[model samples]
Target chain A: GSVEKLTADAELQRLKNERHEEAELERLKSEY
Target chain B: YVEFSEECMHGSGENYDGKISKTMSGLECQAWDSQSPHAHGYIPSKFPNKNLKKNYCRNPDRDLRPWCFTTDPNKRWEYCDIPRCAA
Candidate 1:
């Protein structure tokens, strides 16, 4: 298994989720 | 030296198309149709393009990327160590 690949993927996913959540929060603020 | 890169020329994950046969926890991935350790509904025949062979990790249903049934008795299934491709 590519351990480096896995670690990178995990971190990428984390950042994607974080960005998504932040975007959603902004969207909600504008929606309300 | 520059940071080394793995096989992902696409570098976008979930679309990763390597033949890595291990999951994140380093557990051997079970065959798509295998029921031992864990039973699943995924049939390789149903997904002709998903590379469902020899326990290779593949994403047939788009769930945070390719994942597989674990050979480990304690875990049902988990995401694979598949790397994402670059954009």
Candidate 2:
């Protein structure tokens, strides 16, 4: 059970990180 | 000269990384793909952030190239090339 939840959590976290990274990239682009 | 500051950062596919740096001169964009090892001398010998060259492959398969300074004493960013990967 823990393994399945952990795997799902990891995927969700990765998706969350992708959003943040995209936002960060956009912020960098706008700075110029 | 205003030193380069970290500005924008991102990645490509599963293994590539990209960044946009800021300096008084202009914006310096850089990306490197490291999905796997590469042929010797196929990757670029330099990058923007360091004096010494690092790593072997610039990860050309990912559709981005790396950066380096011109041989000139100016230490400016040299125009990079997207060399065709070895067959």
Candidate 3:
């Protein structure tokens, strides 16, 4: 099946989320 | 000139918040429906910034559909313009 594709997509999404969260944290820290 | 109807321009949202993100959502949806369209992109299952996903594109007050932006650099605009289905 396409399990590999699913896994890869999940990994990409996770990385994007990671970067987004990291940026948000930095923004919040600067505000406080 | 193929001027899109007012309904074509605006989604079902009762009001547009006039923020950049919301404006992106509106523009993305319009382009998605346009006869000749831009490349498409989408939102992931989740967002790192929760508040950022609270807009109309991701959340709707009514039957409005949720959408995400595209990742393709060539297709993307100043804002996230690549909605997945439109591409």
* Top candidate (DockQ): 3
Q: Distance from true position, residue B44, model 2, in Å?
A: 42
Worst 10 residues of 2 chain B by lDDT: B34-43
Residue-level lDDT tens digits of model 2 in B1-87:
225421222231212222312222333322222212221212233223222223211223222333322223332322233233332
Sliding window of 10 residues with minimal summed lDDT for model 3 chain B: B78-87
**What is the per-residue lDDT of model 3 for residues B1-87, given as tens digits with 9 covering 90 to 100?**
324212221443322222233334344332322223333222323223222243223322212333333332322322322232321
Query: Order of all candidates by TM-score, from best down to worst?
Result: 1, 3, 2
Using lDDT, give the best candidate's number.
1
- Please give the ranking of all candidate structures by lDDT, highest first, separated by commas: 1, 3, 2
Please write out the lDDT profile of model 3 over residues A1-32, one tens digit for every residue: 65233553464455445445644765676764
CAPRI band for model 1: incorrect
Superior by lDDT: candidate 1 or candidate 3: 1
- Cα distance off (Å), candidate 2, residue B46: 42
Cα TM-score of candidate 3: 0.24
Give Cα distance to truth, residue B52, candidate 1, Å.
1.7
Native RMSD of candidate 3 (Å):
12.6
Full-model lDDT for every candidate? 0.60, 0.31, 0.33
Interface RMSD over true interface Cα atoms for each candidate: 11.0, 13.7, 10.7
